[PDB]
Amino acid sequence: AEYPLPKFHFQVDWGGSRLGFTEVSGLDVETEVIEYREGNLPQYHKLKMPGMQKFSNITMKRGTFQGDNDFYKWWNTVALNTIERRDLTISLLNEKHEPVVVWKVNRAWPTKVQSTDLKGDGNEVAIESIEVAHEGLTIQNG
Amino acid sequence: AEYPLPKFHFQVDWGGSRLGFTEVSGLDVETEVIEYREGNLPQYHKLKMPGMQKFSNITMKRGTFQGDNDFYKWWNTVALNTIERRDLTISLLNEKHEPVVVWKVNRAWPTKVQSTDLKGDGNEVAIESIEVAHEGLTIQNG
Amino acid sequence: AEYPLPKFHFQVDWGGSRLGFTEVSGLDVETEVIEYREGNLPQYHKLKMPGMQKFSNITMKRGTFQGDNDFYKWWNTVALNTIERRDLTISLLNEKHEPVVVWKVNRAWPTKVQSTDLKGDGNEVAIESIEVAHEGLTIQNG
Amino acid sequence: MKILYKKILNLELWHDFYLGQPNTPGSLPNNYDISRTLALVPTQECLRVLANLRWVFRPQLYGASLFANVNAAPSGQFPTIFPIDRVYRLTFWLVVSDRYFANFTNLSLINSRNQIYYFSNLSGNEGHALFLTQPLSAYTTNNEYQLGQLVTHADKTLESLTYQGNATNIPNPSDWDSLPASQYVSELDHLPRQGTYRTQVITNANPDNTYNFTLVNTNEQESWAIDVIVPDTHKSGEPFSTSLNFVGQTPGHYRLLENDTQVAEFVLVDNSLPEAFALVEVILNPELVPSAFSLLQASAGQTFIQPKTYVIRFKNRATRWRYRYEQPHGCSAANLPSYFNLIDTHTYATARPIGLRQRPDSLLNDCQDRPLPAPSITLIQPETDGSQRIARIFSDIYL
Amino acid sequence: MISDAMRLIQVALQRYILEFEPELGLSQVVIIENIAMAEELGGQNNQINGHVVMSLVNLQEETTLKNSPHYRLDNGRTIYQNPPVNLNLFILFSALHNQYETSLRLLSRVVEFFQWQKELSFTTTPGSRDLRILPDLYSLTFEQLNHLWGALGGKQVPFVLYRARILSLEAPKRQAEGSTITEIYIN
Amino acid sequence: MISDAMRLIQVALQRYILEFEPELGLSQVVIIENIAMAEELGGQNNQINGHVVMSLVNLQEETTLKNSPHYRLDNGRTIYQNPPVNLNLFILFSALHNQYETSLRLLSRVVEFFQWQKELSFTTTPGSRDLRILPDLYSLTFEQLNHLWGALGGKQVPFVLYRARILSLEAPKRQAEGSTITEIYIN
Amino acid sequence: SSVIKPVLKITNEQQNNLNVHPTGKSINAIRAFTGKGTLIWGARTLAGNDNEWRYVSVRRFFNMAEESIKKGSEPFVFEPNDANTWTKVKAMIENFLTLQWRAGALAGAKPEQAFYVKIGLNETMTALDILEGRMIVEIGMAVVRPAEFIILKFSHKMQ
């Protein structure tokens, strides 16, 4: 309550079987600026007012396990213009595992899935990524 | 008065509940150049005169605390083309905490809010950012 | 089954004589977003729905041996608009050499072949690369 | 343009989770703070009324304050810019910020989601402070007290430790604790909350008659009225239900009457702030608030300010502490602190309830002389009786 | 002070270890001392042998708590005082014994003790009633090990590194006093 | 614990080597000790000579297994406990003899032993019935050798480096209990 | 469709007693109008004096919404009764209500004025409810209501 929070203890509800994600990025909101000036205004710069909103895609990365094929499962539910949409919840936890900051996403479906690359000299774990589109985002703190 | 000033002791009045910002950048002013030359001028380069003014957006970064949801609060007061505008004051303090340089911003409303990213291996604090548009800026020193 | 997998023990079936590849990259799938909004919608951002699919080219790198001229052999089977197409299989193996993750490629023909560069001061092995186009990809895990 | 302001009201909120029990209450310490647990919020009517009166609201580290705009007289008395000689009414929401609040605050554990608390300056109770709560009842003989009740007796305040279906002539010292004399919050402030639509039932519905329903607020002003006409095919004597709408009223305490008879009493709500915890009302009326609580004097055709300080107070909860183990502990009934009770080889619990504090002064020692950690405030375990009554409340510590 | 946090951690870890290993004869398992002074590593001290040793290796300031207010309000008057200094602490645990396996056992027990307790305070790990310390574990690369042990003499022992987050320091001294606003004239 | 994995590896490698080299007189070929303490490299210990020595040089956490659940369900009730800590281990094998060729022979045999056995467990390399260790070989550059041996004293011997993947540590202690959902009211 | 004519003719004076009655029981009519065919005229329930359940469409909509909420909040049976589940449930309900608002079913300028959801210890629940295993959620909604009567007034313009 008095200390600033760290950024390494979180969880994601995505209607998937397993949990334990490595990276989650892309949480933004924006509004466009509209500008205006008429000829007789004594200042020689413009006036500004709000416009339309814009939201970003969300990226998630996790490690690969035997028997788990969930990213592909969700991506592959796509017909011509129909797909299975889900509600997404992201929460940041503190030392006593209590949800402190919550991000609520609306109508999210997977737009991209990327698998790992194979290197004969690579001493690292295999990681996979998913990219998701949505129609809304909301922040709740305290 | 005889020494040059450092750049790590400052404060921001933004009509918000808490204080203690990490980074503040974007404080600029500019005027456009207009060029002109007629055919019979003995020099073969142009003449220059002042034009219109231009101002930049301002970015601020701060750390995340439990119970504080102020950036989102201000951003979320937006109707179709109406929003709550505020007067912004930024001041640089010296060793004895006396305001020395003051920047006064006119009509500022938040255009963008970005939250932190989550890393399972990140040993750092979570930081959030806001980007603000305005219709004026003025500098006062001494 | 409980541990995450590494990324350095794999094999490739490509209808070629030899095996032992160094690098394999390019395994992705994607769908395009279509956006829509009508004038009287109370939200001022757009709706999103799925579109067409897209697949990437695949790159493979291996070391050069005396007597082996297989990349060139496959590339050189090209007539005006006809070529020899093959089914490609990529598999990731675990400690006991059991196929765990399988990528199945459909109708793949080589679009590019690059040989090594020669340096009078280069203390490295000579490596060659191939780039392949295909009309489909499928993931099988567990 | 000279503008003079003077403090006119002090509103304080106390909690024994931080304060404890002082042997004689005075003021709060210099480091008191609840700015992260409780908050006071003016309503819309309150805002426009404060605007009309030229008064200023201000939050504080202990509560809030009000500032009035006055004129500097030579006498030392401070008159308002104009005479405030009508009746006025100011309301505030009380909101809770701290989760787990209902665990350390000694509230009723009975399921109540249609009720709300209420505090006012029409409660008397002017003892060692100006208490906005109702006066605590007295300890009597042959009554029924639930676990958790606070009463008054012999210059002291008594807390209940167990269920008693019939009382004694003299307090049984194994059922009651002994605290200093003060008032707190109790179940005497738990009024039923209501929204916009009501279902009212008339008993002995008589088709040959009519009924006029009315609503009366704290200032004894009628605010609302309709009529209901029972049809002439209704067999006389059965109940009859009707729907009522209070869409245009301002939230507050009201009494619903039918033809010169009180039928109901409730706090009306408009869901402008649905998650509010309590409501506070402050009245300006020279006829209803006694002189120990009023804030304005009237003399020489003017009004003069009198600053005051009102107090609300919450008492902490008390639980029995139970130490639980993973592997067996080697302590016995013959080598453990007398204030303990061995349950089994992995468990022992205190014999009397202890009060939850943030910086509990002294901790308990083990049979091998070692300090034991205090409980946490995340979980409490009430145990129901055969008759589905609360019998005990524990706090578990896993070692 | 800095000694109180390390005494708290020492007492708690001592209690845990001696709880799980009764065979150690109720001696002092944990001591607070400088590791680089050990005789076996080229130093001069011959008393650091057969222990777990705690060492403070670095001291950093928390950048997020800078620029906090320099005044407070009380009874309608202003009290001026400088804000405190908030520090992060870096603590190294080293196991040094004449038997290489005892060191590994004690390291394992240190790791699991910090796996159990996520918060150190007088109210939860009793054993100054002001401290509150949230530790975390640091894993290093080979270059960072090189930097560390080059600053410490150039020879490794079985070790582990933790960070303790917040410790606040200040002097008990006021700066000034003033008064607040109660009347305003406009023209 | 950390001692059990190293004892398992020691016993298996000892068995293999003494199987293929009967001439070594059935002595102790493999010992667990700190290499930097050797007298020949400037240390103080005079008993590390004519052996293969195993040393723990680093300890890292597995990032993929963080953020695992903190509760479990049983009999319709919830058991709260903190998740365990998963570690990767770095083990250095050094050969030290008064005859430079014996060291090379023993290094070759170490390499081929790890070439044969891709999994170490009590069920497959009997010689705690909980361990399962998958090793791999690490090849370094000259800068990384510099970092390593600068942290170890600054002098090389014939050596090889391996990584053992997963070892899990935790305390045997519960955190809390709770109950599950069985009834719901909507309005 | 496929109708010739109703068997009886209803007038406005009879409609006055069919549509409103002191007992609340209401009768919706089917009437013929010159040039338009035969049309359904009236949309009230048998509880026509009830301020909440006067109209058919409001009750049917409420039935649909609560059924969808039940189906959404079924999977959490026999899950831990703690804050995380409460967060997830609230998120699901609010997303459904937002989708209903943006199509024109609910009144309000934003989703903050159209509905609210309350679930938690300080909202609708107590420790006793945690021990019992009960979850209580409160949902408020503002629906749009129709216009039944149109009044025209005529005059001679000043000239």
User: Looking at chain D, how many residues does it have?
Assistant: 399
Distance, in Å, from the CA atom of D176 to the CA atom of D170, rounded to the nearest integer, reads: 11
> Residue type for F69, please?
P
CB A141 within 8 A of CB C29: no
CB F55 within 8 A of CB F96: no
**G80:F187 CB<8 A:** no
Distance of CA C29 to the CA centre of its chain: 11
Does the CB of B125 have a partner CB in chain E at under 8 Å?
A: yes
With 0-12 / 13-18 / 19 or more C-beta atoms within 10 angstroms meaning exposed / middle / buried, residue F95 is buried
CB A133 within 8 A of CB C45: no
In the block, which residue shows the tokens 């308002």? D80
Distance, in Å, from the CA atom of F106 to the CA atom of F99, rounded to the nearest integer, reads: 12
Span between the terminal Cα atoms of chain G, in Å: 50
CB B91 within 8 A of CB B11: yes
Does the CB of G129 have a partner CB in chain A at under 8 Å?
A: no
In the block, which residue shows the tokens 């101002």? B55
Q: Tell me how far CA of residue E136 lies from CA of A123, E91, E165, F57, in angstroms.
A: 26, 10, 8, 21
What residues in E contact D363, CB-CB < 8 Å? 126
- Residue D283 has which token pair? 């009245």
CB D287 within 8 A of CB D309: no
CA angle D249, D253, D259 (to 5 degrees): 80
- Residue F66 has which token pair? 């963080």
CB C110 within 8 A of CB C130: yes
Helices (H), chain G: 12-19, 56-72, 83-102, 111-114, 127-132
Q: Please compute Rg for chain B using Cα positions.
A: 21
Closest listed residue to residue D61, CA positions, set B68, E75, A141, A142: E75
**D372:E184 CB<8 A:** no
- Residue D210 has which token pair? 């009519």
- Residue D167 has which token pair? 């009382």
Helices (H), B1-142: 70-75
**How many Å lie between the alpha carbon of F9 and the closest alpha carbon of chain C?**
18
- Residue E164 has which token pair? 């303790």
Closest listed residue to residue E93, CA positions, set E114, E116, E115: E114
- Residue A55 has which token pair? 């939201």
Rounded to the nearest 5 percent, the helix, strand and coil shares of chain A are 5, 50, 45
- H/E element, A72: helix A70-75
Nearest residue on chain A to D36, alpha-carbon basis: A1
SS3 label, residue A70: helix
Left if phi > 0, otherwise alpha if psi is -120 to 50, otherwise beta: which for F25?
left
- H/E element, C139: strand C137-141
With 0-12 / 13-18 / 19 or more C-beta atoms within 10 angstroms meaning exposed / middle / buried, residue E127 is middle
What residues in F contact D347, CB-CB < 8 Å? none
Distance, in Å, from the CA atom of F71 to the CA atom of D332, rounded to the nearest integer, reads: 33
In the block, which residue shows the tokens 């600029």? B28
Residues forming beta bridges with residue A25, ordered by sequence position: A59
Residue B132 carries which DSSP code?
Answer: E
CB D308 within 8 A of CB D10: yes
Distance, in Å, from the CA atom of D375 to the CA atom of A55, rounded to the nearest integer, reads: 45
- Residue G80 has which token pair? 């831990």
Helix axes E3-20, E100-116, angle to 10 degrees: 110
**F175:D398 CB<8 A:** yes
Residue G158 has a CB neighbour count (10 Å cut-off) of 4
Residues forming beta bridges with residue C128, ordered by sequence position: C62
Residues forming beta bridges with residue D12, ordered by sequence position: D63, D311
B22 backbone dihedrals φ, ψ, rounded to 5° = -90, -55
CB G136 within 8 A of CB D113: yes
Q: Please compute Rg for chain A using Cα positions.
A: 21
What residues in E contact D372, CB-CB < 8 Å? 126
Neighbors of chain F by Cβ distance (3+ pairs < 8 Å) = A, B, C, D, E, G
What residues in D contact A1, CB-CB < 8 Å? 36
3-state secondary structure chain F: CCHHHHHHHHHHHHHHHHHHCHHHCCCCCEEECCHHHEHHHCCCECCCCCEEEEEEEEEEECHHHCCCCCEEEECCEEEECCCCEEEEEEEEEEEECCCHHHHHHHHHHHHHHHHHCCCECCCCCCCCCCCCECEEEECCCHHHHHHHHHHCCCCCCCEEEEEEEEEEECCCCCCEEEEECCEEEEC
Distance, in Å, from the CA atom of F88 to the CA atom of F136, rounded to the nearest integer, reads: 11
Distance, in Å, from the CA atom of D356 to the CA atom of D397, rounded to the nearest integer, reads: 14
Q: Tell me how far CA of residue A74 lies from CA of A56, A86, C4, C29, in angstroms.
A: 20, 10, 21, 13
Distance, in Å, from the CA atom of D40 to the CA atom of D54, rounded to the nearest integer, reads: 20
Left if phi > 0, otherwise alpha if psi is -120 to 50, otherwise beta: which for B57?
beta
In the block, which residue shows the tokens 């723990």? F56
Distance, in Å, from the CA atom of G96 to the CA atom of G105, rounded to the nearest integer, reads: 12
Q: Which of E58, E61, E62, E64 to mutate to test the interface with B (most CBs of B within 10 A)?
A: E64
Residues 6+ apart with CB under 8 A from C71: C110, C113, C128, C130
Distance, in Å, from the CA atom of D391 to the CA atom of C30, rounded to the nearest integer, reads: 62
CB A119 within 8 A of CB C59: no
Distance, in Å, from the CA atom of F133 to the CA atom of F166, rounded to the nearest integer, reads: 6
CB D111 within 8 A of CB G128: yes
Q: Is the dihedral of CA D356, D361, D367, D371 positive or negative?
A: positive
The tally of CA atoms less than 13 A away on the side-chain side of residue E15 is 16
Q: For G119-137, give one letter per residue: b (16+ CB within 10 A) or e.
A: bbbbbbbbbbbbbbebbbb
**How many Å lie between the alpha carbon of F118 and the closest alpha carbon of chain C?**
7
**C51:A81 CB<8 A:** yes
Q: Tell me how far CA of residue D73 lies from CA of D303, E30, F45, F172, in angstroms.
A: 12, 73, 94, 75
- Residue E125 has which token pair? 């790990």
3-state secondary structure F81-97: CCCCEEEEEEEEEEEEC
Helices (H), G1-55: 12-19
With 0-12 / 13-18 / 19 or more C-beta atoms within 10 angstroms meaning exposed / middle / buried, residue D388 is exposed
Closest listed residue to residue D279, CA positions, set D101, D40, D111, D46: D40
Distance, in Å, from the CA atom of C126 to the CA atom of F67, rounded to the nearest integer, reads: 43
Does the CB of F174 have a partner CB in chain B at under 8 Å?
A: no
Q: Which of E88, E118, E139 to mutate to test the interface with A (most CBs of A within 10 A)?
A: E118
Q: Is the dihedral of CA E111, E116, E118, E122 positive or negative?
A: negative
- Residue D37 has which token pair? 């647990």
Q: What is the largest CA-CA distance in chain F?
A: 86
What residues in G contact C41, CB-CB < 8 Å? 102
Across the beta sheet with E71-74, what order do the strands follow?
E71-74, E77-80, E176-179
Residue G138 carries which DSSP code?
Answer: E
> Residue type for D228, please?
V
Q: Tell me how far CA of residue G143 lies from CA of C42, E138, G52, G61, G95, in angstroms.
A: 16, 56, 10, 9, 17
Closest listed residue to residue C9, CA positions, set C26, C25, C21: C21
Does the CB of C41 have a partner CB in chain G at under 8 Å?
A: yes
Distance, in Å, from the CA atom of B32 to the CA atom of B48, rounded to the nearest integer, reads: 10
What residues in C contact G101, CB-CB < 8 Å? 42
Left if phi > 0, otherwise alpha if psi is -120 to 50, otherwise beta: which for C81?
alpha
Across the beta sheet with E51-61, what order do the strands follow?
E30-32, E51-61, E85-96, E159-169, E135-138
Distance, in Å, from the CA atom of C43 to the CA atom of C45, rounded to the nearest integer, reads: 6
CB E91 within 8 A of CB E161: yes
- Residue F151 has which token pair? 């942290």
**How many Å lie between the alpha carbon of B89 and the closest alpha carbon of chain F?**
42
Q: Please compute Rg for chain C using Cα positions.
A: 21
Helix axes F142-151, E142-151, angle to 10 degrees: 40
The tally of CA atoms less than 13 A away on the side-chain side of residue D238 is 8
In chain C, positions 104-133, which contact chain A (CB-CB < 8 Å)?
none
Distance, in Å, from the CA atom of D300 to the CA atom of D84, rounded to the nearest integer, reads: 13
SS3 label, residue E64: helix
**How many Å lie between the alpha carbon of F69 and the closest alpha carbon of chain A?**
8
Residue D75 has a CB neighbour count (10 Å cut-off) of 7
SS3 label, residue G34: coil
CB F172 within 8 A of CB E16: no
- Residue G54 has which token pair? 């006067």
In the block, which residue shows the tokens 């210890």? G121
**E62:A4 CB<8 A:** yes
CB G83 within 8 A of CB G119: no
CB F91 within 8 A of CB F53: no
Residue G124 carries which DSSP code?
Answer: T
Report the relative pairing of strands D340-344 and D347-350 from DSSP bridges.
antiparallel
Rounded to the nearest 5 percent, the helix, strand and coil shares of chain E are 30, 30, 35
Does the CB of A45 have a partner CB in chain D at under 8 Å?
A: no
Closest listed residue to residue D67, CA positions, set D10, D18, D13, D26: D10
CB F81 within 8 A of CB E118: no
Does the CB of F147 have a partner CB in chain D at under 8 Å?
A: no
**Interface present between C and A (3 or more CB pairs within 8 Å):** yes
**G66:F187 CB<8 A:** yes
Q: Please compute Rg for chain G using Cα positions.
A: 23
B73 backbone dihedrals φ, ψ, rounded to 5° = -55, -50
Residue B32 has a CB neighbour count (10 Å cut-off) of 10
Neighbors of chain C by Cβ distance (3+ pairs < 8 Å) = A, F, G
The tally of CA atoms less than 13 A away on the side-chain side of residue D329 is 21
Q: For D313-338, give one letter per residue: b (16+ CB within 10 A) or e.
A: bbbbbbbbbbbbbeeebebeeeebee
Strands (E), chain B: 10-13, 23-25, 29-36, 47-55, 58-63, 86-93, 99-114, 118-119, 127-133, 137-141
Residues forming beta bridges with residue D186, ordered by sequence position: none
Residues forming beta bridges with residue E30, ordered by sequence position: E52
Distance, in Å, from the CA atom of E113 to the CA atom of E9, rounded to the nearest integer, reads: 11
CB F52 within 8 A of CB F95: yes
Residues 6+ apart with CB under 8 A from C20: C62, C63
Residue G4 has a CB neighbour count (10 Å cut-off) of 6
Q: Which of C37, C40, C43 to mutate to test the interface with G (most CBs of G within 10 A)?
A: C43
3-state secondary structure chain D: CEEEEEEEEEEEEEEHHHHCCCCCCCCCCCCCCCCCCEEEEECHHHHHHHHHHCEEEEECCCEEEEEEEECCCCCCCCEECCCCCCCEEEEEEEEECCCCHHHCCCCCCCCCCCEEEEECCCCCCECCCEECCCCCCECCCCCCECCCCEEEECCEEEEECCCECCCCCCCCCCCEEEECCCCCCCHHHEEEEECCEEEEEECCCCCCCCEEEEEEECCCCEEEEEEECCCCCCCCCCCEEEEEECCCCCCEEEEEEECCCEEEEEEECCCCCCCCCEEEEEEECCCCCCCCCCCEEEECCEEEECCEEEEEEECCCEEEEEEECCCCCCCCCCCCCCCEEEEECCEEEECCCEECCCCCCCCCECCCCCECCCCCCCCCEEEECCCCCEEEEEEEEEC
Method by which this entry was solved: cryo-EM
Does the CB of A42 have a partner CB in chain B at under 8 Å?
A: no
Q: Is the dihedral of CA E32, E35, E38, E43 positive or negative?
A: negative
In the block, which residue shows the tokens 């702030």? D273
Residues 6+ apart with CB under 8 A from B13: B88, B89, B90, B91
Closest listed residue to residue B11, CA positions, set B67, B92, B129: B92
**How many Å lie between the alpha carbon of E87 and the closest alpha carbon of chain F?**
25
Q: Among A89, A98, A107, select the one facing G91 at the smallest CB separation.
A: A89
